[PDB]
Design an enzyme around this catalytic site. Structure first.
Site, PDB file in Angstrom:
ATOM      1  N   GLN A  47       1.000  -1.162   0.675  1.00  0.00           N
ATOM      2  CA  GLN A  47      -0.384  -0.033  -0.286  1.00  0.00           C
ATOM      3  C   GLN A  47       0.827   0.981  -0.045  1.00  0.00           C
ATOM      4  O   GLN A  47       0.931   2.284  -0.367  1.00  0.00           O
ATOM      5  CB  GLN A  47      -0.736   0.197   1.378  1.00  0.00           C
ATOM      6  CG  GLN A  47      -2.493   0.617   1.105  1.00  0.00           C
ATOM      7  CD  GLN A  47      -3.019   0.931   2.213  1.00  0.00           C
ATOM      8  OE1 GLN A  47      -4.272   1.791   2.244  1.00  0.00           O
ATOM      9  NE2 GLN A  47      -3.195  -0.409   2.892  1.00  0.00           N
ATOM     10  N   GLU A  64      -4.813  -6.072  -2.922  1.00  0.00           N
ATOM     11  CA  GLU A  64      -5.543  -5.321  -2.463  1.00  0.00           C
ATOM     12  C   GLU A  64      -6.102  -4.245  -3.470  1.00  0.00           C
ATOM     13  O   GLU A  64      -5.221  -3.106  -3.801  1.00  0.00           O
ATOM     14  CB  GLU A  64      -6.082  -4.487  -1.058  1.00  0.00           C
ATOM     15  CG  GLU A  64      -5.172  -3.402  -0.766  1.00  0.00           C
ATOM     16  CD  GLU A  64      -5.041  -2.786   0.725  1.00  0.00           C
ATOM     17  OE1 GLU A  64      -6.404  -3.248   1.322  1.00  0.00           O
ATOM     18  OE2 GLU A  64      -4.256  -2.116   0.595  1.00  0.00           O
ATOM     19  N   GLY A 114       3.438  -3.191   6.404  1.00  0.00           N
ATOM     20  CA  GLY A 114       3.247  -3.968   4.908  1.00  0.00           C
ATOM     21  C   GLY A 114       3.613  -5.806   4.983  1.00  0.00           C
ATOM     22  O   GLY A 114       4.400  -6.250   4.015  1.00  0.00           O
ATOM     23  N   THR A 169       1.963  -7.360   2.354  1.00  0.00           N
ATOM     24  CA  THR A 169       2.339  -7.014   1.168  1.00  0.00           C
ATOM     25  C   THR A 169       3.760  -6.359   1.151  1.00  0.00           C
ATOM     26  O   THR A 169       4.866  -6.692   0.016  1.00  0.00           O
ATOM     27  CB  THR A 169       1.090  -6.798   0.086  1.00  0.00           C
ATOM     28  OG1 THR A 169       1.440  -5.472   0.747  1.00  0.00           O
ATOM     29  CG2 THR A 169      -0.093  -7.200   0.293  1.00  0.00           C
ATOM     30  N   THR A 194       1.988   2.836  13.611  1.00  0.00           N
ATOM     31  CA  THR A 194       0.707   2.155  12.205  1.00  0.00           C
ATOM     32  C   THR A 194       0.595   0.647  12.594  1.00  0.00           C
ATOM     33  O   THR A 194      -0.340   0.215  11.899  1.00  0.00           O
ATOM     34  CB  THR A 194      -0.114   2.728  10.958  1.00  0.00           C
ATOM     35  OG1 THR A 194       0.711   1.983  10.225  1.00  0.00           O
ATOM     36  CG2 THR A 194       0.715   4.363  11.322  1.00  0.00           C
ATOM     37  N   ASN A 222       9.707   6.789   8.842  1.00  0.00           N
ATOM     38  CA  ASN A 222       8.409   8.358   8.865  1.00  0.00           C
ATOM     39  C   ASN A 222       8.331   9.115   9.533  1.00  0.00           C
ATOM     40  O   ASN A 222       7.974   9.419   9.613  1.00  0.00           O
ATOM     41  CB  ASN A 222       7.241   7.200   9.671  1.00  0.00           C
ATOM     42  CG  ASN A 222       6.723   6.433   7.932  1.00  0.00           C
ATOM     43  OD1 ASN A 222       6.248   7.452   6.938  1.00  0.00           O
ATOM     44  ND2 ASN A 222       6.415   5.541   7.857  1.00  0.00           N
ATOM     45  N   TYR A 272       0.439  12.013   3.048  1.00  0.00           N
ATOM     46  CA  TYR A 272       1.308  11.553   2.985  1.00  0.00           C
ATOM     47  C   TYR A 272       1.609  11.746   2.050  1.00  0.00           C
ATOM     48  O   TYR A 272       2.602  11.547   1.264  1.00  0.00           O
ATOM     49  CB  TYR A 272       0.624  10.030   2.687  1.00  0.00           C
ATOM     50  CG  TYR A 272       1.125   8.979   4.047  1.00  0.00           C
ATOM     51  CD1 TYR A 272      -0.117   9.137   5.213  1.00  0.00           C
ATOM     52  CD2 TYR A 272       1.675   7.939   4.410  1.00  0.00           C
ATOM     53  CE1 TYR A 272       0.547   8.547   6.406  1.00  0.00           C
ATOM     54  CE2 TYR A 272       1.793   7.593   5.254  1.00  0.00           C
ATOM     55  CZ  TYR A 272       1.588   7.457   6.825  1.00  0.00           C
ATOM     56  OH  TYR A 272       1.321   6.734   7.553  1.00  0.00           O
ATOM     57  N   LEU A 316      24.030   2.685 -11.350  1.00  0.00           N
ATOM     58  CA  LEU A 316      23.498   1.901 -10.549  1.00  0.00           C
ATOM     59  C   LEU A 316      24.569   1.227 -10.212  1.00  0.00           C
ATOM     60  O   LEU A 316      24.871   0.613  -9.130  1.00  0.00           O
ATOM     61  CB  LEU A 316      21.944   1.305 -10.937  1.00  0.00           C
ATOM     62  CG  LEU A 316      21.425   1.954 -11.415  1.00  0.00           C
ATOM     63  CD1 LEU A 316      19.754   1.193 -11.580  1.00  0.00           C
ATOM     64  CD2 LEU A 316      20.265   3.069 -10.190  1.00  0.00           C
ATOM     65  N   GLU A 372      28.293   0.624 -10.515  1.00  0.00           N
ATOM     66  CA  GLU A 372      29.103   1.497  -9.724  1.00  0.00           C
ATOM     67  C   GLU A 372      28.356   1.700  -8.320  1.00  0.00           C
ATOM     68  O   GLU A 372      29.108   1.078  -7.248  1.00  0.00           O
ATOM     69  CB  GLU A 372      28.889   3.269 -10.157  1.00  0.00           C
ATOM     70  CG  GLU A 372      29.319   3.199 -11.171  1.00  0.00           C
ATOM     71  CD  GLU A 372      29.807   4.913 -11.722  1.00  0.00           C
ATOM     72  OE1 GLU A 372      29.950   5.503 -11.538  1.00  0.00           O
ATOM     73  OE2 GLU A 372      29.855   4.826 -13.019  1.00  0.00           O
TER      74      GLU A 372
HETATM   75  N1  LIG Z   1       7.275   6.515   3.641  1.00  0.00           N
HETATM   76  C1  LIG Z   1       6.282   5.847   3.340  1.00  0.00           C
HETATM   77  N2  LIG Z   1       5.423   5.234   4.623  1.00  0.00           N
HETATM   78  C2  LIG Z   1       4.260   4.593   4.505  1.00  0.00           C
HETATM   79  C3  LIG Z   1       3.225   4.588   3.975  1.00  0.00           C
HETATM   80  N3  LIG Z   1       2.515   4.744   3.416  1.00  0.00           N
HETATM   81  C4  LIG Z   1       2.129   3.818   4.512  1.00  0.00           C
HETATM   82  N4  LIG Z   1       3.396   3.671   4.793  1.00  0.00           N
HETATM   83  C5  LIG Z   1       3.968   2.798   5.809  1.00  0.00           C
HETATM   84  O1  LIG Z   1       4.096   1.360   5.413  1.00  0.00           O
HETATM   85  C6  LIG Z   1       3.804   0.860   7.096  1.00  0.00           C
HETATM   86  C7  LIG Z   1       2.224  -0.379   6.601  1.00  0.00           C
HETATM   87  O2  LIG Z   1       2.650  -0.553   5.694  1.00  0.00           O
HETATM   88  P1  LIG Z   1       1.187  -0.601   3.743  1.00  0.00           P
HETATM   89  O3  LIG Z   1       2.438  -0.100   2.604  1.00  0.00           O
HETATM   90  O4  LIG Z   1       0.246   0.506   3.725  1.00  0.00           O
HETATM   91  O5  LIG Z   1       0.565  -2.016   4.374  1.00  0.00           O
HETATM   92  P2  LIG Z   1      -0.388  -2.946   3.385  1.00  0.00           P
HETATM   93  O6  LIG Z   1       0.359  -2.921   1.671  1.00  0.00           O
HETATM   94  O7  LIG Z   1      -1.276  -2.344   3.535  1.00  0.00           O
HETATM   95  O8  LIG Z   1      -0.745  -4.170   3.995  1.00  0.00           O
HETATM   96  P3  LIG Z   1      -1.442  -5.574   3.951  1.00  0.00           P
HETATM   97  O9  LIG Z   1      -1.706  -4.841   4.566  1.00  0.00           O
HETATM   98  O10 LIG Z   1      -1.011  -6.803   4.065  1.00  0.00           O
HETATM   99  O11 LIG Z   1      -2.044  -6.127   2.304  1.00  0.00           O
HETATM  100  C8  LIG Z   1       2.769   1.596   8.006  1.00  0.00           C
HETATM  101  O12 LIG Z   1       3.391   1.848   8.887  1.00  0.00           O
HETATM  102  C9  LIG Z   1       3.316   3.368   7.309  1.00  0.00           C
HETATM  103  O13 LIG Z   1       4.342   3.584   8.714  1.00  0.00           O
HETATM  104  C10 LIG Z   1       3.937   5.763   2.365  1.00  0.00           C
HETATM  105  O14 LIG Z   1       2.729   6.778   1.728  1.00  0.00           O
HETATM  106  N5  LIG Z   1       5.013   6.790   2.811  1.00  0.00           N
HETATM  107 MG   LIG Z   2      -1.796  -3.063   1.178  1.00  0.00          MG
END
Ligand SMILES: Nc1nc2c(ncn2[C@@H]2O[C@H](COP(=O)(O)OP(=O)(O)OP(=O)(O)O)[C@@H](O)[C@H]2O)c(=O)[nH]1
Ligand SMILES: [Mg+2]
Ligand SMILES: Nc1nc2c(ncn2[C@@H]2O[C@H](COP(=O)(O)OP(=O)(O)O)[C@@H](O)[C@H]2O)c(=O)[nH]1
Ligand SMILES: Nc1nc2c(ncn2[C@@H]2O[C@H](COP(=O)(O)OP(=O)(O)O)[C@@H](O)[C@H]2O)c(=O)[nH]1
Lengths: 426, 427, 160, 427
Positions: B11, B61, B133, B135, B169, B196, B214, B242, B244
């Protein structure tokens, strides 16, 4: 009569190479379109050293360029004076190396150099008698140090007894621009000492120092820096092209300043310099050259020569001046400076006088030097190379590409024989 | 000739990747509709004059992929390059890695082959993820396992989002980040991280912003990706590859995790007063406040530094800066690397965006530095898991997919093996 | 000049269509001549071509081709009036306008005309058939187009 | 100059033949009445191939339609292109075949065909250089199969040395829409292998699969299903009629595609599967096309290439495309398909280039091939036909009409003869 070939290696070599043929095309009166329009007739008499005659009074460089980055080669293509270069004289590869020595030499070296030798032999058999080769390579860059050695190695194996006059940039204290630069520099010297006729240790830090302290430019970008480096090359190679009151062709230059088969590193210098404060306050004479000849402000390598001696010094003075004024200025300082020079070779300077001055200038002076102050540069290069093997770090990329660790140790066998030979006469 | 391929998984990677190609079209002066050499590295041409981006967004998703389809850039992104996940792993590593991801990972390799044959010359792959995440931690892991199978040596940059030391989070993040580090050790070429909180912290005190989104984060992160790729993007005085800095900035097969730091983070109202010299920005480079990894630089030792200067910079004061840098006693480096520096110089300054908060400055600078102080963050990542695994917490969720029970502790031994060498190499 | 130039581009597309259907136009002309049973004199009048199409037209495709050619000629005659009111012109411009009127004239002949260098109507038509029977009807359009382009260039070079 | 006659049987090709003669009329710029409103005379040189001239500058069809149920004749007569066929081309009987091979062959077929065979001399003797005949029929419908094979018997004996091309729809694995399909097909393929020069196999199920996975048409009605089937056989015949840079007549495809006499079932395909929303997302390039002629999805049968064996391949290219790029990429794909093409015929493929495209498209390709996996299409019938005879099904509709039971046992051996030859010469 005598024809010459310009090899090139590395991305940094392109900017040195492109400014080189930009500088020397001006001094013969050549436009980037390729139409000669000039008044001097002596240039066209000896134009056959560098270029190659084309139809309609056009001439094409004998420049061979090898690299692994088309993006800078596209810039060389889009460069202003690059439109005189021949299309197949460019040898450009699609795959890069990654600033490592092995990728250019072994993996990508197995295919690109087959396209190089065909370009060479195409240019080789069209000439009368080939005087030799020039290659602008490096020690801090991965690609320039890599293929530059294999460019050296196969041509020496193909050409038994010719000249090989190279220009290589050495590591520096404060312009350290690569972590694996001590890895890249040391093993490149392994292919240099055995197999190279001439190499000129130009150091970047002095090039920055001279543009700051000595030429005093407000914003001296790299185009200024290559403007020194190209003119140092041309001072070496203006006697072969231009007649003078005391001529010294490159072969006897290679005879005189190379006393031993190995200890043939060179330390250039070229100081017709004038700051933007000082256009008129200088008194441009042969005596002012001599004080400026051995001042530390003028030389290309970041070393203090008061920690040693000069072995051989050549002072090619190009411009209108008298031989009795030339020699006597150096004759006094050979007697006066009894300490700064070596004692086992009396009459430490043999000169050469050229008549034609460079364009946009009145009178200029060069310098070619081997010295016994290059120990500590060679000493400090070795000491980290030993220290980089104690922690064994960064070597697994070279190790992981199929290579031995002993090839890193065999250079330390060979480089220590280099520095101990300088220790023998000192 | 050169081209770049980027993969966005998770995500965050979709949300981060939204701001990235927003910058790429604006830096190259391309409208989002898809029409108007230097654009060779990111866009593949259509015979009618359109350019197709070389970005792959895979998410389990649909709720954010289809959001991209509702964006203005729907007339830009290729319809088959967006892959809709039927079911989301939902922060469960074993779901995508062992049950869910097998259905759509076959579709991803079809996109990879289709983009590879369109690529006449490949510089490498760009991988974007966050450590929270599932994923972004699991679906990458069998993708990065897969991406080693077809290609072994071409560049693979795993752009990572490190968890913040004090906030998150997520809850199962100490499980996921442990499961991330096993695959990256065994397969991955390069991986930069930011956290973050320092992205939150810099926009508090430098940009003076109280209420960001965000998008206001990801606009800063895409600048870093712009700065690293700017050598391949545009001709400069000192172009880098790259491969390098993958050879250069990485010291060891175990440690390919440096940090990221960008400057000048100076707002539009703010830059009008300042005097921007290169010595000014590089003295602003090594302050701990400007880094985007909240960890004290005086805990460890500096190892390497990459200073991608861009704009109108003259290489004189570049060298005197590092010389001024090397004299100080507060900044400590490693004795087995006295040459620990490299500077990149590119001509074109970055372009500001309408509605943005940054300033139009003549000179910009990035930092790709590895430091032994990151063990303190990784000691925390070992300690947070140790406070979680003592009494068998949350084990039932991962095991129900089919993965084994005792192999959680295997990665603890594998994480500690990575943590053992920081006292060996560091001392 | 753009208002007349739009009709000029439409006439250019129509002339391209007629050049593509040149073989069908030649077959229609041969069929009309065979039906009229007067092959001693060559085709020289647009009025003669219209009379050939009105009564001595055989096939539906031939009638469509003859109608398209007559419509192209009528569109050229209608655009001549709009080109006349563009500029006052010089004596050479008036002479060229009179030449354009003579080329659009039905009573004026067409056999003495010849195709231009860019046109390949002479390279396409038969030797004797275009030399003695129907060369001018094929070649009239490209010479008129070249004259119109020359007049447009003359007006562009002429200050207003 | 070159003329070939089309006979029509069954309601199946009655629905293709309206769409199939739409395309050739569209390609030649013909109004639904049948007159001419075109741009060039190039098509008129070889417009005589499938038409005849009429007094008053009209062009009349060379297509004869025969059925024993007069419903589809009048519907074709009253269709969108119904006022174009000349009114003795239609021949209609009284008692339909009722999806029974027996019913449409002996007791009802014989009365119709004698009047039909008189129409054959009326159409054949008009042509000067009559190369042969084509027949579009079905293996599922009774009249197209049973009465069609009778025409195959009668025409070949009277006209021995011509070219016989049959475009036949074949039964499918999961779109089996008639109960007597292994009875209808086997009683035709007993005579199809014996007495047909060119046979083309069309699978219904793949056509539904083509319009779903890549076209994404919302409502795939039978106008859309007839659209591609017409377009494939339109591209087959354009090398006979329209000049190209490298030409191949119909016998030219007949000689080289057929190594052994009993193996003449062909498997076709059509290349630009471009969608309605992603035309501008596709680089209209021949390096896109070759992986589209040889993908896992673009076939027109239930015969996977990994489950098949490519003996001969004809790739008819249509449009303005370069020679060298195509010829090298045809050399490219045979090399990387090391185990997909056969080994005992080196240089398997024919390239065919026709200059003139279809309307509304720059470049166009048809992939036509012979594979052994048409026996796997046949073995689905073969495993269904043998077990169904063991339980004595549906005999009264056949054996109540007068044929002995012995030649039905010959058919399950003769159909076993066909699949024995594919399996024997596979190795
Ligand atoms: N730097 C940065 N971190 C992000 C951002 N959005 C979410 N995160 C971080 O990503 C973490 C969670 O990862 P996600 O990619 O949002 O979770 P997910 O892909 O929905 O994982 P699933 O629920 O299994 O699909 C959080 O703790 C956030 O700190 C963003 O836009 N920038
Ligand atoms: Mg996700
Ligand atoms: N003389 C000169 N040296 C340069 C120039 N640009 C870079 N260098 C030096 O070249 C080194 C880097 O070489 P590199 O580009 O990695 O060599 P390559 O990998 O073979 O292309 C740096 O340490 C610089 O000091 C230039 O324009 N002129
Ligand atoms: N794909 C496709 N199949 C058709 C079409 N028309 C008929 N069929 C097939 O043909 C079978 C019926 O054949 P039919 O047309 O009635 O032939 P007839 O009974 O001999 O007149 C059905 O099982 C259909 O699957 C068509 O337009 N498209």
């Amino acid at each position: 009569m005598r024809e010459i070939v310009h090899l090139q290696a590395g991305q940094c070599g392109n900017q040195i190479g492109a400014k080189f043929w930009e500088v020397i095309s001006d001094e013969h009166g050549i436009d980037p379109t390729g139409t000669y329009h000039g008044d001097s007739d002596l240039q066209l008499e000896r134009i056959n050293v560098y270029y190659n005659e084309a139809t309609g009074g056009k001439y094409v460089p004998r420049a061979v360029l090898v690299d692994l980055e088309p993006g800078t080669m596209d810039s060389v293509r889009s460069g202003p004076f690059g439109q005189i270069f021949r299309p197949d004289n460019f040898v450009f590869g699609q795959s890069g190396a990654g600033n490592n020595w092995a990728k250019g030499h072994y993996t990508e070296g197995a295919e690109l150099v087959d396209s190089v030798l065909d370009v060479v032999r195409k240019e080789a058999e069209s000439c009368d008698c080939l005087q030799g080769f020039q290659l602008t390579h490096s020690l801090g860059g991965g690609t320039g140090s890599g293929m530059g050695t294999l460019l050296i190695s196969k041509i020496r194996e193909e050409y038994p007894d010719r000249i090989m006059n190279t220009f290589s940039v050495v590591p520096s204290p404060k312009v350290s621009d690569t972590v694996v630069e001590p890895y890249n520099a040391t093993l490149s010297v392994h292919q240099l000492v055995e197999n190279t006729d001439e190499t000129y240790c130009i150091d970047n830090e002095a090039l920055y120092d001279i543009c700051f302290r000595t030429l005093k430019l407000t914003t001296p970008t790299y185009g200024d820096l290559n403007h020194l480096v190209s003119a140092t090359m041309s001072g070496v190679t203006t006697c072969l092209r231009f007649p003078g009151q005391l001529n010294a062709d490159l072969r006897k230059l290679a005879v005189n300043m190379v006393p031993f088969p190995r200890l043939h590193f060179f330390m250039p210098g070229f100081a017709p310099l004038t700051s933007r404060g000082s256009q008129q306050y200088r008194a441009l004479t042969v005596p002012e050259l001599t004080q400026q000849m051995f001042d530390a402000k003028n030389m290309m390598a970041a070393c203090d020569p008061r920690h040693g001696r000069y072995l051989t010094v050549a002072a090619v003075f190009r411009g209108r001046m008298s031989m009795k004024e030339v020699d006597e200025q150096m004759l006094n300082v050979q007697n006066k400076n009894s300490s700064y020079f070596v004692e086992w070779i009396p009459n430490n300077v043999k000169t050469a006088v050229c008549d034609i001055p460079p364009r946009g200038l009145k009178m200029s002076a060069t310098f070619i030097g081997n010295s016994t102050a290059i120990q500590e540069l060679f000493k400090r290069i070795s000491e980290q190379f030993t220290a980089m093997f104690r922690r064994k770090a960064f070597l697994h990329w070279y190790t992981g590409e199929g290579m031995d660790e002993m090839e890193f140790t065999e250079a330390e066998s060979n480089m220590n024989d280099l520095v101990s030979e300088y220790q023998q006469y000192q | 000739m050169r081209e770049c391929i980027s993969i966005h998984v998770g995500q965050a990677g979709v949300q981060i990747g939204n701001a990235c190609w927003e910058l790429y079209c604006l830096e190259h002066g391309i409208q989002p509709d898809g029409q108007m050499d230097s654009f060779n590295t990111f866009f593949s041409e259509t015979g009618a004059g359109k350019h197709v981006p070389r970005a792959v967004f895979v998410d389990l998703e649909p709720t954010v992929i289809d959001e991209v389809r509702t964006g203005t850039y729907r007339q830009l992104f290729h319809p088959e390059q967006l892959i809709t996940g039927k079911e989301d792993a939902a922060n469960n590593y074993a779901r995508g890695h062992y049950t869910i991801g097998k259905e759509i990972i076959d579709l991803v390799l079809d996109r990879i082959r289709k983009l590879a044959d369109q690529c006449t010359g490949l510089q490498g792959f760009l991988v974007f993820h966050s450590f929270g995440g599932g994923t972004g931690s699991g679906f990458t892991s069998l993708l990065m396992e897969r991406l080693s199978v077809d290609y072994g040596k071409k560049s693979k940059l795993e752009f990572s989002i490190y968890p913040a030391p004090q906030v998150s989070t997520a809850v199962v993040e100490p499980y996921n980040s442990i499961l991330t580090t096993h695959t990256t050790l065994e397969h991955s070429d390069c991986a930069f991280m930011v956290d973050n909180e320092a992205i939150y912290d810099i926009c508090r005190r430098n940009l003076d912003i109280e209420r960001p989104t965000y998008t206001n984060l990801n606009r800063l992160i895409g600048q870093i990706v712009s700065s690293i790729t700017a050598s391949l993007r545009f001709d400069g005085a000192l172009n880098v590859d790259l491969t390098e800095f993958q050879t250069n900035l990485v010291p060891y097969p175990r440690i390919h995790f440096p940090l990221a730091t960008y400057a000048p983070v100076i707002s539009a109202e703010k830059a009008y007063h300042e005097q921007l010299s290169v010595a000014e920005i590089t003295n602003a480079c090594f302050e701990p406040a400007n880094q985007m990894v909240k960890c004290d630089p005086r805990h460890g030792k500096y190892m390497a530094c990459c200073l991608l200067y861009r704009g109108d910079v003259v290489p004189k004061d570049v060298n005197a800066a590092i010389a001024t840098i090397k004299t100080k006693r507060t900044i400590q480096f490693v004795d087995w690397c006295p040459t620990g520096f490299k500077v990149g110089i590119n001509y074109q300054p970055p372009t500001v965006v309408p509605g943005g908060d940054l300033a139009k400055v003549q000179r910009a600078v990035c930092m790709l530095s590895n430091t032994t102080a990151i063990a303190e963050a990784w000691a925390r990542l070992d300690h947070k898991f140790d406070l979680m695994y003592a009494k068998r917490a949350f084990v039932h969720w991962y095991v129900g997919e089919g993965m084994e029970e005792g192999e959680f502790s295997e990665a603890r031994e594998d994480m500690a093996a990575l943590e053992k060498d920081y006292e060996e190499v560091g001392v | 000049m753009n208002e007349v130039k739009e009709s000029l581009r439409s006439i250019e597309q129509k002339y391209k269509l007629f050049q593509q259907q040149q073989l069908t136009f030649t077959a229609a002309l041969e069929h009309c001549r065979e039906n009229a049973h007067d092959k001693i004199r060559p085709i020289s009048s647009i009025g003669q071509v219209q009379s050939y199409m009105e009564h001595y037209c055989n096939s539906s495709t031939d009638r469509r081709v003859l109608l398209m050619f007559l419509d192209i000629c009528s569109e050229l005659n209608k655009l001549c009036q709009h080109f006349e009111a563009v500029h006052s012109g010089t004596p050479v411009t008036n002479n060229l306008l009179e030449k354009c009127k003579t080329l659009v004239s039905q009573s004026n002949d067409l056999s003495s005309l010849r195709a231009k260098y860019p046109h390949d109507v002479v390279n396409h038509l038969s030797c004797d058939e275009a030399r003695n029977h129907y060369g001018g009807v094929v070649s009239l359009i490209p010479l008129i187009l070249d004259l119109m382009k020359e007049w447009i260039a003359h007006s562009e070079k002429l200050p207003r």
